[PDB]
Amino acid sequence: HWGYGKHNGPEHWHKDFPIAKGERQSPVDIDTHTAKYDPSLKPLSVSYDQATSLRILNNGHAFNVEFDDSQDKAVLKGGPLDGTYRLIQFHFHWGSLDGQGSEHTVDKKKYAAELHLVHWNTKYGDFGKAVQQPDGLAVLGIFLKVGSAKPGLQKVVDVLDSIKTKGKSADFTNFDPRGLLPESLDYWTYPGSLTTPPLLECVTWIVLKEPISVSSEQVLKFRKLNFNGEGEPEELMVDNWRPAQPLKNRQIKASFK
Numbered sequence: 001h002w003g004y005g006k007h008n009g010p011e012h013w014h015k016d017f018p019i020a021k022g023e024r025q026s027p028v029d030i031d032t033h034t035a036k037y038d039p040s041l042k043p044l045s046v047s048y049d050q051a052t053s054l055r056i057l058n059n060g061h062a063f064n065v066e067f068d069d070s071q072d073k074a075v076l077k078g079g080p081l082d083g084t085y086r087l088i089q090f091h092f093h094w095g096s097l098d099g100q101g102s103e104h105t106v107d108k109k110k111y112a113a114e115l116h117l118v119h120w121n122t123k124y125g126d127f128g129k130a131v132q133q134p135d136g137l138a139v140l141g142i143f144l145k146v147g148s149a150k151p152g153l154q155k156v157v158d159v160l161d162s163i164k165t166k167g168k169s170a171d172f173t174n175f176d177p178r179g180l181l182p183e184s185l186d187y188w189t190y191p192g193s194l195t196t197p198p199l200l201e202c203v204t205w206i207v208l209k210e211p212i213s214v215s216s217e218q219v220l221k222f223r224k225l226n227f228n229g230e231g232e233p234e235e236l237m238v239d240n241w242r243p244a245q246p247l248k249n250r251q252i253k254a255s256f257k
């Protein structure tokens with residue numbers, strides 16, 4: 001099945017998932033001098049006070065921190081969004097080295113990693129229905145650079161030893177995702193897709209301008225994770241990012257000048 005290696009990676013995905021070459025694929029390079037400032041965009045509203053985290057899972061591609069999405073406990077609204085989008089999970093993509101790892105790029109710059117907070121449009125009732133709709137998901141993307149430690153990330157880093165291999169999960173309750181955000185909510189936005197198979201074209205991308213800083217020790221612990229399952233030969237979980245895809249017939253809007 002699919003992965004990020006030479007024989008099953010992004011270059012191969014189109015065979016099982018021909019949408020890989022479709023009209024609104026993600027990620028993309030954000031050319032900052034082509035994006036259009038849109039003064040009509042309302043501020044982003046990130047409401048995570050009642051967020052209820054549940055469990056963390058190594059899924060053999062990255063790791064998911066899952067949330068209780070049975071009520072409007074943690075929602076994203078405003079910006080380019082119509083209505084209410086409920087937080088369901090977050091995960092990251094990262095590199096083998098600090099100079100690569102992000103999925104989106106900014107003027108061709110690759111960050112060390114990228115955080116994705118995934119939300120679904122409540123008008124569609126559940127996540128599985130939402131992914132079948134052109135406005136089904138909103139994914140909030142945040143770049144990571146290596147510098148000072150991110151205190152709000154440490155609880156995540158601390159638990160990775162217990163989910164080293166594919167299929168392993170651990171209890172991950174009472175985690176506050178607000179600790180993962182930068183100060184500024186300035187953003188770029190464009191219509192795109194899931195960046196992994198089945199690559200469904202259901203995502204409003206909201207990518208924050210301001211990266212968060214994480215320490216070298218924090219990112220190093222991400223890179224000790226394994227793609228393989230327990231007892232199998234070790235394949236380090238690194239470079240689990242899809243490269244930039246053609247922008248095609250799309251416009252990236254900016255919340256800021």
Ligand SMILES: CC1(C)O[C@@H]2[C@@H](CO[C@@]3(COS(N)(=O)=O)OC(C)(C)O[C@@H]23)O1
Pocket residue numbers: 059061062063064091092116118139193194195196
């Ligand atoms: C851990 C990783 C890489 O991300 C998880 C899961 C399956 O892929 C995802 C990708 O979400 S994304 N990158 O489009 O926000 O698609 C969903 C189903 C949203 O879950 C995401 O594997």
Ligand SMILES: [Zn+2]
Pocket residue numbers: 091092093116195
């Ligand atoms: Zn992702």
